[PDB]
Design a protein that fits this description.
It is classed as photosynthesis. The entry lists the keywords thylakoid membrane, chlorophyll plastid, photosynthesis, oxyphototroph. The structure of PSI-CAC(L-14)of R.salina at 2.7 angstroms resolution. This is part of a larger assembly, with chains A, B and C. Chain A is mostly helical. In chain A, 48% of the residues lie in helices and 0% in strands. In chain A, helix 1 crosses helix 2. Chain A starts with 32 loop residues before the first helix and ends with a helix. The relative contact order of chain A is 0.20. By secondary structure, chain B is mainly alpha-helical. Chain B has eight helices and no strands. By secondary structure, chain C is mainly alpha-helical. The chains are: A mainly alpha, B mainly alpha, C mainly alpha. Chains in contact: A-B, A-C, B-C. Chains B and C meet through helix 5 of B and loops of C. Bound molecules: chlorophyll A (7 copies), the ligand CC1=C(C#C/C(C)=C/C=C/C(C)=C/C=C/C=C(C)/C=C/C=C(\C)C#CC2=C(C)C[C@@H](O)CC2(C)C)C(C)(C)C[C@H](O)C1 (2 copies) and the ligand CC1=C(C#C/C(C)=C/C=C/C(C)=C/C=C/C=C(C)/C=C/C=C(C)/C=C/C2=C(C)CCCC2(C)C)C(C)(C)C[C@H](O)C1 (2 copies). One chlorophyll A binds next to helix 3 of chain C.
Chain lengths: 90, 180, 172
């Protein structure tokens, strides 16, 4: 009804192709599909290992294993980015 | 062809170092050939180091290790150093050091194996590591096949050495010297 | 192709004109972040690490008057704890935070592009009035800073094992 503002750097992200344009990856638009795929497995293995090491949680947990455990959900976003880049030829 | 019965798939090109028509099980149809070539060169080099180290860890040992390792042979040394490091011991971190540096090397050389599959300039296994220049200045290509043959032999040899230890406590030299 | 890593392809965001260029970006980190942000960050890490390395060495060699009775044994990072109970570390924190508020502003115009990475125009003495000696000093700043980052890691980590501190660890 009046112009709706968006932050500067807003671009069009609507896609009807096989994969979205690499612009949907933000700062990771130039990373290769191999680099996400290897990061995806690495984050999954390290994240699972760190998660596994603190499953009985104590009042003194290792803070690196807590921080390293956040790599497991982060790996999910990594393989999605790996699939997007592979299907954009990157 | 290596096996007249079952020849190699047409997926394998015949211009690769070490191509001797050997793929009866068609394992190059089940994966990328560039990945497989890279994997076998890496397996070859790791196994060459493992085999030479198995022989050397018998003929001559680095100073001081007998207090940290005793008389354990090839598989045992790994377990015992990691046992000593499991206490807080400073002088038993050889395993963590080698794992760190090899992991760091595989981390920073990791984009190479994806560039080769993506059509990149570099051929499988080539890191341009020729400090002495012996292979480069001289005509190269025989050394590739020598590397591949020695690497395949090293893989089988590591297999032998390890499993011979897993049965009898002898290492390489002890097991070869006699015949139980 | 890349200079430092011959197997790897040349980093797309990295160019020869930039100081301390060896074509070294195996992980392609320059593609992820804005290059000017990384360049300012490298220079900032370099200059703090040079101060830290010289500080480690000098704190081995001599100590300022009266510090011996505030802190007796602690040498590398143990002093930090003793002085946080006192007010020394807090005072340095406050004044570096002042300088880093103006560094926040400075980084904003760097991202606007009107300021070069690491360029604070702080050249009181006449050491950059050639634009040939300036480029050599630019390269030497980057290289000595990188060496200082690795050295600061080696000095503190050596203290973590031994507690000796750098030059004492050298002597014994
Ligand atoms: C399921 C949730 C989700 C998903 C898919 C993403 C996905 C992404 N985020 Mg977002 N983000 C999230 C939650 C999420 N974020 C949350 C909870 C926060 C708050 C801490 C942020 C704050 C955040 C910031 C501040 C930025 C991103 C950025 C990015 C992109 C960087 C990709 C990358 O690192 O490449 C390698 C990517 C599109 C970056 C970007 O480019 O955004 C478009 C960026 O600058 N994220
Ligand atoms: C980790 C083990 C490993 C791997 C991945 C490979 C991989 C490969 N070999 Mg090698 N090879 C090995 C061990 C291995 N080899 C050993 C131990 C021997 C000796 C007993 C051989 C002897 C050999 C010959 C003689 C030939 C190959 C060939 C091949 C290729 C065919 C694809 C294939 O069969 O995949 C195999 C995957 C697994 C076995 C796993 C491929 C590059 C053929 C080729 O094209 O040369 C490069 C070929 O002619 N290999
Ligand atoms: C798979 C490889 C492998 C593994 C896991 C081990 C692991 C071990 N070795 Mg064995 N060793 C190896 C290879 C290996 N070694 C090789 C190749 C040699 C030389 C023939 C030796 C000779 C050796 C001796 C003499 C001794 C050990 C010992 C040990 C233990 C302590 C660590 C140590 O000092 O290593 C020492 C290992 C080396 C000095 C190997 C360095 C050789 C490098 C790899 C050559 C690299 C060349 C090139 C420049 C690098 C390529 C760069 C390129 C990739 C960019 C540990 C169990 C000690 C022990 O307690 O055993 C009882 C011991 O006394 N090793
Ligand atoms: C490059 C390989 C290398 C070299 C040159 C040496 C050299 C030496 N070691 Mg050995 N050592 C090595 C690898 C090596 N080490 C490895 C890989 C381990 C196990 C992780 C050990 C564990 C070890 C112990 C536990 C001790 C030595 C000690 C020593 C020193 C005295 C010699 C001795 O006691 O006999 C000697 C300089 C002794 C030492 O420091 O005494 C001064 C000693 O106590 N070494
Ligand atoms: C049989 C051994 C052998 C052979 C013939 C080759 C041959 C080659 N390698 Mg490979 N390599 C090997 C083992 C070998 N390598 C091992 C074990 C490693 C792991 C450290 C590597 C790591 C490696 C990398 C990372 C690269 C090569 C490359 C190359 C090529 C050019 C370099 C060159 O000509 O050097 C010739 C090498 C030799 C003649 C090996 C010297 C062996 C000496 C004579 C004895 C070894 C002593 C050893 C420590 C064990 C002692 C005995 C023990 C029982 C005590 C060529 C195909 C490069 C390439 O493909 O592109 C250019 C490359 O980037 N290699
Ligand atoms: C916190 C430390 C830090 C930071 C932010 C940087 C940042 C940078 N470095 Mg430097 N570098 C450092 C430490 C650091 N470096 C150290 C300790 C060394 C010595 C090993 C080097 C050696 C080095 C070389 C040889 C080169 C770079 C290059 C680069 C740039 C691209 C690579 C990149 O994204 O790296 C991000 C790294 C981290 C976040 C860690 C970027 C400006 C390249 C360039 O073009 O320079 C302008 C280049 O050629 N660096
Ligand atoms: C964070 C740094 C720091 C700290 C904690 C101290 C702490 C102290 N200084 Mg000070 N001092 C410092 C830096 C510092 N100094 C600097 C940078 C200088 C200039 C070089 C001085 C110059 C100085 C003088 C001249 C004197 C002290 C003295 C003293 C001590 C007075 C009580 C005593 O020991 O008797 C006190 C503990 C007194 C002292 O005992 O020195 C012998 C004294 O007279 N200080
Ligand atoms: C590349 C390159 C460089 C380099 C380099 C390097 C590190 C080169 C190293 C090459 C090496 C280490 C080759 C070793 C291969 C080992 C083999 C073939 C063993 C097979 C075992 C068998 C057959 C067995 C056995 C058996 C026995 C005896 C004992 C029994 O109990 C067990 C069993 C019965 C099984 C340099 C630095 C030169 C620069 C250059 O510019 C580029
Ligand atoms: C004049 C002035 C200017 C200025 C300025 C200033 C203050 C410039 C100061 C620059 C500094 C502080 C440079 C110091 C670098 C230290 C390095 C490279 C460390 C090397 C150590 C190594 C290799 C090691 C080690 C060690 C290990 C790890 C463990 C130890 O056990 C052993 C050991 C010690 C051997 C500016 C530009 C601001 C403007 C204007 O012009 C006015
Ligand atoms: C130290 C360490 C560990 C470890 C470990 C390791 C390294 C274990 C070793 C694993 C290996 C390398 C096994 C080898 C398998 C190769 C075989 C069976 C050869 C088949 C070839 C055949 C049948 C025929 C070949 C042929 C011949 C006859 C010639 C004609 C052609 C052909 C028909 C192809 C543990 C587990 C102890 C744990 C410990 O905490 C850390
Ligand atoms: C003040 C205070 C503290 C503190 C503190 C401090 C000062 C902490 C500082 C920590 C630092 C500076 C760590 C740096 C580590 C550097 C590394 C791992 C580089 C490795 C190089 C690699 C892997 C490869 C290099 C490479 C090789 C060789 C070949 C290829 C090329 C190259 C890339 C050069 C505490 C925590 C004690 C608490 C206390 O209450 C208050």
């Amino acid at each position: 009804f009046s112009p709706v503002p968006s932050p500067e750097g807003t671009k069009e992200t609507y896609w009807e192709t096989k994969a979205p344009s690499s612009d949907v990856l933000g700062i990771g638009a130039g990373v290769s599909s191999g680099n996400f795929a290897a990061a995806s497995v690495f984050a999954a293995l390290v994240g699972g290992y760190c998660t596994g090491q603190v499953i009985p949680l104590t009042v003194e947990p290792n803070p690196l294993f807590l921080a390293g455990s956040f790599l497991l959900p982060y790996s999910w976003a990594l393989h999605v980015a790996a699939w997007i880049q592979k299907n954009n030829g990157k | 062809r290596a096996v007249p019965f079952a020849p190699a798939p047409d997926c394998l090109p015949e211009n690769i170092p070490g191509y001797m028509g050997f793929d009866p099980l068609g394992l190059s149809t089940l994966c990328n050939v560039e990945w497989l070539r890279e994997a076998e060169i890496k397996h070859c080099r790791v196994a060459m180091l493992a085999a030479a180290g198995s022989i050397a860890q018998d003929l001559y040992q680095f100073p001081g290790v007998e207090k940290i390792v005793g008389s354990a042979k090839m598989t045992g040394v790994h377990d015992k150093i990691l046992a000593a490091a499991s206490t807080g011991d400073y002088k038993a971190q050889a395993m963590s050091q080698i794992l760190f540096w090899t992991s760091f090397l595989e981390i920073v050389t990791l984009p190479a194996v994806f560039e080769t599959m993506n059509g990149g300039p570099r051929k499988p296994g080539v890191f341009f590591f020729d400090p002495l220049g012996l292979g480069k200045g001289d005509k190269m290509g025989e050394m590739e096949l020598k590397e591949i043959k020695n690497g395949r032999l090293a893989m089988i040899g590591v297999g032998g050495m390890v499993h011979h230890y897993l049965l009898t406590g002898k290492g390489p030299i002890q097991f070869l010297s006699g015949i139980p | 192709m890349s200079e430092s890593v011959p197997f790897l392809k040349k980093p797309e965001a990295l160019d020869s004109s930039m100081a301390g260029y060896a074509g070294f970006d195996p992980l392609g980190l320059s593609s992820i972040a804005d290059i000017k942000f990384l360049q300012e960050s490298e220079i900032k890490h370099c200059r703090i690490a040079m101060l830290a390395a010289a500080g480690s060495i000098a704190q081995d060699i001599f100590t300022f008057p009266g510090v011996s009775k505030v802190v007796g044994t602690a040498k590398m990072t143990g002093v930090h704890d003793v002085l946080v109970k006192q007010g020394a570390m807090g005072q340095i924190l406050l004044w570096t935070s002042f300088l880093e508020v103006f560094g926040t502003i400075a980084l904003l115009e760097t991202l606007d592009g009107k300021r070069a990475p690491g360029d604070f125009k702080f050249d009181p003495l006449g050491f950059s009035k050639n634009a040939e000696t300036a480029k050599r000093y630019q390269l030497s700043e980057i290289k000595n800073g990188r060496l200082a980052m690795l050295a600061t890691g080696g000095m503190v980590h050596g203290y973590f094992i031994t507690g000796k501190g750098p030059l004492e660890l050298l002597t014994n």
